[PDB]
């Protein structure tokens with residue numbers, strides 16, 4: 001069966017270069033072109049170019065010429081790509097694709113029935129940083145709201161639970177947002193009976209694996 | 223009365239028992255003598271659709287040329303990545319001779335005599351023949367060498383010009399000689415010569431034809447963007463040697479002075495990437511002595527840059543398509559049909 | 563080029579989605595589906611032909627330059643974003659998301675002043691929560707001493723809650739500790755279909 005196997009995602013700094021691989025299997029590699037496509041969230045998908053494993057001939061979109069290099073290793077059926085002078089504009093998920101129709105006689109490149117799992121690439125100047133966690137303290141009908149503010153971490157993602165997962169109902173963990181500083185921020189709130197605040201203790205379980213920071217923040221009425 | 227069909231064709235040539243050149247010999251074995259008296263019957267008020275991009279005849283020639291290269295261009299060693307095999311490295315005397323392709327009983331070949339037929343669509347002037355004209359299996363990249371010529375004016379061939387992954391074939395209506403020499407006595411330093419005046423003139427015409435098929439946008443040429451030397455360079459076999467010529471100069475935008483003779487720097491290689499499939503072949507060191515091939519450029523292979531949108535410009539680069547395209551550039555006007 | 567519409571599409575399971583694509587060049591047109599966090603899947607090519615494993619529910623049609631992809635009887639798997647493609651060119655995408663219909667519910671509104679721990683760090687975030695509301699459209703209005711704050715905050719909204727089918731929104735206004743201590747009255751004004759009139763939650767700096 002046709003399978004495109006991609007190397008994982010990565011975090012670059014602006015100015016650097018990135019390299020990705022894509023090993024094809026289940027078919028005759030020389031039969032038809034390999035493509036590289038980038039998809040940035042809420043942005044029109046961009047075809048970067050194609051490579052014909054036979055001879056290694058290439059075709060680059062005007063936009064990328066001089067920055068991108070596509071090659072292959074015919075023996076291992078692996079396609080390679082490099083992108084130089086990265087800018088934030090380059091942040092995206094990078095895919096390799098192959099057309100549906102691909103025989104010895106001929107092909108049709110542009111019906112992408114086969115895709116790699118994708119390689120998510122973020123380019124920014126932020127360095128991996130663990131979140132400082134601040135309380136969102138409740139205040140005195142029968143329900144009170146409270147949470148933790150998880151601010152200034154990079155990169156995504158962070159996970160948040162309550163009282164070690166013992167508390168699930170009422171929990172609202174919002175999508176992170178990217179601040180103008182390059183660091184992420186998100187909030188996690190929960191509603192509870194405002195009569196529990198007196199006795200019931202509420203804890204914030206924050207886990208940010210990328211920085212190995214694990215915080216148990218106790219939230220209490222102020 | 224008839225229908226489109228594939229089948230096993232046989233070859234015909236003018237190969238002579240006395241000639242010992244390798245291609246000639248292969249033919250004395252594979253083919254039969256060319257028909258002494260050809261018969262071309264014009265088919266009255268008839269119309270037929272051709273598609274050179276899907277012509278099974280191309281596949282059959284392919285298998286022959288692979289057969290031909292297996293007994294005429296056997297390398298000293300083959301590196302298939304998985305193994306490295308040694309084998310006899312016979313001296314090679316190779317000079318392609320015209321090969322005719324013919325149909326067996328119950329079938330027949332159809333020929334399109336429209337003087338500006340670009341390779342796809344209906345043909346008005348149709349005739350019936352038992353064999354193609356003699357076609358030479360010349361293996362080369364970027365430039366199509368020693369082929370037939372357009373009978374009217376320059377013709378742009380493509381399965382679909384708006385599809386950048388489809389090969390473009392230009393068919394000159396007036397050949398241009400390319401004189402290639404490697405002096406005797408670095409025994410790799412070779413060069414090629416072309417008349418700048420004749421060449422550049424032919425460029426004006428092709429680009430003017432190209433512009434015609436792209437809603438009058440500025441046509442500009444650029445060197446290849448990457449890939450193996452077989453692809454980024456004009457590559458061909460001369461007197462058993464493998465030439466590799468830099469074509470930057472032929473596609474000079476400004477020249478479209480520029481009247482004199484332009485000379486390409488070529489290099490001869492002993493280690494090459496085999497076209498028949500995958501792996502590197504190793505041929506012996508260059509023999510001593512002056513080596514000189516004079517060929518006729520009759521067609522060009524182009525790839526259009528993709529992802530334009532804005533502009534205003536269309537950018538073409540020499541090469542590359544596929545080796546089967548060389549045969550297509552000659553088989554374009556023929557198709558096999560079956561009686562009943 | 564390829565102009566795809568609409569940008570977004572909020573529909574319930576069972577309904578039919580009609581995504582549109584306008585071309586100018588023509589030639590085999592294809593549609594892709596991308597599920598949250600997964601690689602796109604070819605859905606249709608040649609404008610009208612289904613790929614392998616694509617059920618009858620997906621169908622495409624054409625009229626001149628205009629191309630439609632139609633998804634009937636929506637179900638969980640169908641939601642995501644869809645792209646039209648012509649050779650190397652793609653459309654801007656259409657996000658198709660799930661909105662299960664329910665009775666209108668007004669937001670519960672809470673405002674949170676910055677914690678002392680954060681102020682010690684020399685920065686201040688004011689948070690306004692809009693909890694469990696329907697439908698999804700809602701407006702947040704920051705005011706600092708009666709001055710309207712335009713472009714000084716960031717919003718984030720949850721996907722529709724699986725249990726009660728409501729939405730929740732969080733708005734964060736960030737300021738320098740120095741700026742925060744310049745002003746006194748911090749207000750959050752919420753307007754929604756469930757509110758007969760806009761609701762303003764507020765507080766004065768430094769008041770327990």
Ligand SMILES: *[C@@H]1O[C@H](CO)[C@@H](O[C@@H]2O[C@H](CO)[C@@H](O[C@@H]3O[C@H](CO)[C@@H](O)[C@H](O[C@H]4O[C@H](CO)[C@@H](O)[C@H](O)[C@@H]4O)[C@@H]3O)[C@H](O)[C@H]2NC(C)=O)[C@H](O)[C@H]1NC(C)=O
Nearest residue numbers: 243315317318360367368458459460461514515516517518
């Ligand atoms: C494009 O086609 C042209 C002709 O259409 C073709 O040019 C021809 O090349 C062949 C081979 O290079 C030439 O034939 C030669 O003639 C000379 C004598 O004048 C011989 O020296 C050559 O080799 C002889 O000696 C060799 C010693 O090893 C023997 O191996 C060999 O069998 C011969 O005995 C050879 O016979 C022919 O003269 C030219 N014709 C012209 C008009 O120049 C050219 O090769 C084609 N280009 C490509 C890329 O195929």
Ligand SMILES: *[C@@H]1O[C@H](CO)[C@@H](O)[C@H](O)[C@H]1NC(C)=O
Nearest residue numbers: 264265266267268269346348
């Ligand atoms: C068919 O060909 C015959 C043979 O010449 C010719 O007389 C006749 O006009 C043609 N019919 C048409 C419709 O052209």
Ligand SMILES: *[C@@H]1O[C@H](CO)[C@@H](O)[C@H](O)[C@H]1NC(C)=O
Nearest residue numbers: 340341342343378379380383
């Ligand atoms: C070939 O010629 C006709 C137009 O006269 C038609 O099949 C098609 O438009 C042409 N194709 C090219 C590449 O010129």
Ligand SMILES: *[C@@H]1O[C@H](CO)[C@@H](O)[C@H](O)[C@H]1NC(C)=O
Nearest residue numbers: 374375376395396427428431
């Ligand atoms: C080649 O074709 C061009 C049109 O593309 C024409 O102007 C020129 O005269 C032709 N050359 C010959 C020798 O017919």
Ligand SMILES: *[C@@H]1O[C@H](CO)[C@@H](O)[C@H](O)[C@H]1NC(C)=O
Nearest residue numbers: 399401402403415514515516
């Ligand atoms: C090929 O070039 C050589 C070296 O310039 C020259 O002597 C010879 O005349 C040329 N051949 C032809 C046919 O012009």
Ligand SMILES: *[C@@H]1O[C@H](CO)[C@@H](O)[C@H](O)[C@H]1NC(C)=O
Nearest residue numbers: 445446451454455468469470
């Ligand atoms: C051909 O020559 C040009 C100009 O001399 C040079 O820049 C380029 O590297 C060469 N191209 C190849 C493919 O060797």
Ligand SMILES: *[C@@H]1O[C@H](CO)[C@@H](O)[C@H](O)[C@H]1NC(C)=O
Nearest residue numbers: 580581582623629630631632
């Ligand atoms: C095609 O899109 C048009 C644009 O609104 C719409 O009216 C029509 O219903 C769509 N066709 C299908 C089959 O969805």
Ligand SMILES: [Cl-]
Nearest residue numbers: 107108109387
């Ligand atoms: Cl294609």
